[PDB]
Design a protein around this ligand. Structure first.
Ligand code: HEM
Ligand code: HEM
Ligand SMILES: Cc1cc(N)nc(CCc2cccc([C@H](N)Cc3cc(C)cc(N)n3)c2)c1
Ligand SMILES: Cc1cc(N)nc(CCc2cccc([C@H](N)Cc3cc(C)cc(N)n3)c2)c1
Ligand SMILES: C[C@H](O)[C@H](O)[C@H]1CNc2nc(N)[nH]c(=O)c2N1
Ligand SMILES: C[C@H](O)[C@H](O)[C@H]1CNc2nc(N)[nH]c(=O)c2N1
Ligand SMILES: [Zn+2]
Lengths: 403, 404
């Protein structure tokens, strides 16, 4: 059945028919929904994902059935028959990476899907080479605060060997140092990776915002450590437009959100190291990273600096402080001339995206629980929009940590 | 290892498996191909099957499964269904099933309170006038001068051939929505349709933003009849802000008693078409959705202007600031007036505790994440960080089509 999809603010109705093209089961069953879970609980098969993808591609450039389409399908058939695998042409890779982003149900930034700079790093044979690539990516994507979306794609997985991998989950991450006294100094989300870096030879700092080194690993080798040159790592000091004490808290965050541990799947080929970046939405930093209890957890501190009654929930001290902190992030990013989008502008743009996708493809897979921001949900138009979630390919997938 | 879904809390890093979901006898809207969790709204041997399960549920809740009273009550129920097509609940069965429908509601965050329901049995009711009296009594009991008490009143079950008992209003207290000669709405846009119906059926309308509506009550095979609630029974709270002295001058207000009137309570296959139930409010329902939704009272811009915020740009967070202050006004005004209310922090914290109780007691809790997480400050509340499994158990409250 093609599901009915209603927006309850405007009363408007669409039908998702794009979900028919999913070939990959999600976690839900008619007996129970698991859409709030973060993680999911032959060569004939490669060949049919390859065919489907090459069809996607020739259709995308309007040359379906053409000589070139039919010859390219033979190339792939011929290559899989003989080798159990194949290779994509740069133009295909580029179309695949764009379509992976477009298909990502948890991304609120997808109106930007077509504007993606793809660096082909498949000609890479060492951790050293990977580092050089990763550095040019940072330089490009950062662009002196005028951030630009980008992916760099490292060599695909092959049956006969270990994967290329970036052990870090993002390219820029702040150390979290566990204390004898149980507590964490720095970002508690990164304690395990910090410890791995120390163990593979890094000399640690002891600050709340020590930028971490990369652990890059080429196939079947121990990973290697590379420190990022600080001048490549753009950071923004947090201040508040009206509250002067705020700056004194010493808070900061990096400009560049670059995911580096997700697998990119194209035409049934898999790219284990394929880091990608855009720009931040303020709530990611101001609400989750700084206010989550199991992150920097700065909410009391701020609320105490604001002289708020902390002794009861019903004063809404938590809510008031979170708002100011999100404000600080937006103000400081603007002042520093680094790209940021607030959650209202972002969600407005995502509604426009659903609408473009409805005309173009007949649907947009989307994960309501990740699209609605972590503060002021019902204040944003997406709260009120029903959404259908399902897995199209090309796709970004979660993968297990390599250790 | 267990082939039950694993449920994780990402704040604390703890894990459970829901085994309760195995007792679901009714499919929801999702499939392996696509998840539809975010959508608001997607007899004979059959009844006998539902009734046996419910009776079995009753006998376990009192620890007599397999007992002689148990096998006899099963026998009574097949006998009654055999000779009439339906059967009837014992009083203590109705009490149990009503509580179990509340406990089973995936969308209710207030379920730590589920054991405390007062169940008014109104299965003797025989006219619309009598529904009115029962409803008035419900409101008086539940409101209790601001010290609110959970309650439900249960009217006669659906019967074959004979028509239903039905309350046409969706809630017992609702503000009028008056459609204007331009196209705007005065009052609550949510209630334009029931307003128009009240007027068609003979109600003389007001012209305020907060006109309390009358009730359209429908006894079997009869046209609905109209009943004005006496104003003294409808407790309202005028809204003011603790420090922003101008907020009181906006004349905003809300009623104390949240009381759903159009849901069907299903127990053991039996269908109670009129069974209104009431609790108390979580502040975000009033201060965020009812007052600030674009398609409700929509006051966010007005408040932001009073607060002097820059409304010409999203990145001032003018909406976020105004919403916070409205929510605080709601909490503050309810507290000052000694009317029970719970803020979104206390509610959600209570619901985590309920989850833990229910893990021990039943091996899971059906929960709808999009509804349980509040509409402001989501990730500041612990439920944001808690995975939830959603499924249908019975007894249940189910949505039903409007009677008209
Ligand atoms: C250009 C600006 C972009 C914005 C504002 C944006 C925004 C977001 C946000 C807010 C999330 C949720 C993140 C969280 O809660 O941790 C997200 C998730 C994601 N976005 Fe983006 N995005 C952007 C660009 C991109 C690009 C360039 C890619 C890939 C090429 C991408 C792929 C994803 C994916 C795969 C996720 C899911 C991550 C996960 O599952 O952990 N987005 N996006
Ligand atoms: C005692 C205090 C209670 C609180 C604070 C409370 C809180 C809530 C909240 C916040 C919602 C979401 C409503 C919305 O978004 O419009 C809700 C839904 C609901 N609650 Fe409660 N609840 C309470 C008592 C009750 C009682 C006594 C019943 C039934 C006996 C009940 C059954 C429900 C049901 C069925 C829904 C879903 C309604 C729908 O789908 O439209 N709750 N609850
Ligand atoms: C390109 C881009 C733009 C933007 N504005 N934001 C981002 C944030 C990305 C991000 C960062 C840290 C952690 C996670 C995710 N929380 C990491 C994660 C963990 C697990 C266990 C599962 C899963 N699916 N995901 C995702 C990326
Ligand atoms: C007892 C109780 C306590 C409390 N704190 N809050 C309430 C909220 C009541 C309520 C009111 C208006 C609209 C809806 C729901 N939005 C009404 C609705 C509409 C549709 C189409 C589907 C659906 N499932 N629901 C639900 C009840
Ligand atoms: C359990 C729940 O799914 C989990 O907390 C999700 C909720 N929604 C989210 N949404 C975004 N955008 N990012 C997140 O990390 C999460 N966490
Ligand atoms: C589209 C989406 O399902 C819808 O707007 C839901 C989201 N969560 C909600 N949650 C509650 N508690 N109440 C609601 O009315 C809604 N609306
Ligand atoms: Zn689902």
């Amino acid at each position: 059945k093609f599901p009915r999809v209603k927006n309850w603010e405007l009363g408007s109705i669409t039908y998702d028919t794009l979900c028919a093209q999913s070939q990959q089961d999600g976690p839900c069953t008619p007996r129970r929904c698991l859409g709030s879970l973060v993680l999911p609980r032959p060569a004939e098969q490669l060949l049919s994902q390859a065919r489907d993808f090459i069809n996607q591609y020739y259709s995308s450039i309007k040359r379906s059935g053409s000589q070139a389409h039919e010859e390219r399908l033979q190339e792939v058939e011929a290559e899989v028959a003989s080798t159990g695998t194949y290779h994509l042409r740069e133009s295909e890779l580029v179309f695949g990476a764009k379509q992976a982003w477009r298909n990502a149900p948890r991304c609120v930034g997808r109106i930007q899907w077509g504007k993606l700079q793809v660096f082909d790093a498949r000609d890479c044979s060492s951790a050293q080479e990977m580092f050089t690539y990763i550095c040019n990516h940072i330089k490009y994507a950062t662009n002196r605060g005028n951030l630009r979306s980008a992916i760099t794609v490292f060599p695909q997985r092959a049956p006969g060997r270990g994967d290329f991998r970036i052990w870090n989950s993002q390219l820029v991450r702040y150390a979290g140092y566990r204390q004898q006294d149980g507590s964490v100094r720095g970002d508690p989300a990164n304690v395990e990776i910090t410890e791995l870096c120390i163990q593979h030879g890094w000399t640690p700092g002891n600050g709340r915002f020590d930028v971490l080194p990369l652990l890059l690993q080429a196939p079947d080798e121990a990973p290697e450590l590379f420190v990022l040159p600080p001048e490549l790592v753009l950071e923004v000091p947090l201040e508040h437009p009206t509250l002067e004490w705020f700056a004194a808290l010493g808070l900061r965050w990096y400009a560049l959100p670059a995911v580096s541990n997700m697998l990119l799947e194209i035409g049934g080929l898999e790219f284990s190291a394929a880091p990608f970046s855009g720009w931040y939405m303020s709530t990611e930093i101001g609400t989750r990273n700084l206010c989550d209890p199991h992150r920097y957890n700065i909410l009391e501190d701020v609320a105490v600096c604001m002289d708020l009654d902390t002794r009861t929930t019903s004063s809404l001290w938590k809510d008031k402080a979170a708002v100011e902190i999100n404000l600080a992030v937006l103000h400081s990013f603007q002042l520093a001339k680094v790209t940021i989008v607030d959650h209202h502008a972002a969600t407005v743009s995502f509604m426009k995206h659903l609408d473009n996708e409805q005309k173009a493809r007949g649907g947009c897979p989307a994960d309501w629980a990740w699209i609605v921001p972590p503060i002021s949900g019902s204040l944003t138009p997406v709260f009120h929009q029903e959404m259908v979630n399902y897995i199209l390919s090309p796709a970004f997938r979660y993968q297990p940590d390599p250790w």
